[PDB]
């Protein structure tokens, strides 16, 4: 059957208020994404003022760092 | 005048979908990427564990940076 104004118009708001929350799920995670890469990015400078001291267990931090989302350690 | 009709209601209600169908991608992309930092911190934080009977002060900076607010 052939939707009246009213009906599509209801259509529209539902969809206009997910947006509105949809907004604000993507900024609050693109926050928290910001946050941790910035802490990841602290840690690596960390790691590099320290590297002069070859630790293996700042190695093992490096590694974490370095890892693809394939699993893989590589750097940069 | 004022009031629109059943097919302008209708083209709003599709680009309002069509603009959530690509927000919702964006969401899930990002969704991704903090559990991907999440996982490497939460993986740092034990190392760090592991390792902290040895007072290594920067191991104790690595920690401060995971906890910071």
Do not use: H, M, S
């Not at 840690?43 to 989302?69: F, H, K, M, S």
């Amino acid at each position: 059957e052939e939707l009246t104004a009213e009906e599509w118009k209801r259509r529209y708001e539902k969809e206009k208020e997910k947006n509105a929350r949809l907004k604000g799920k993507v900024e609050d995670l693109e926050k928290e994404r910001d946050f941790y890469f910035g802490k990841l990015r602290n840690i690596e400078l960390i790691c590099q003022e320290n590297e002069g001291e070859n630790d293996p267990v700042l190695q093992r931090i490096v590694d974490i760092l370095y890892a693809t989302d394939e699993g893989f350690v590589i750097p940069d």
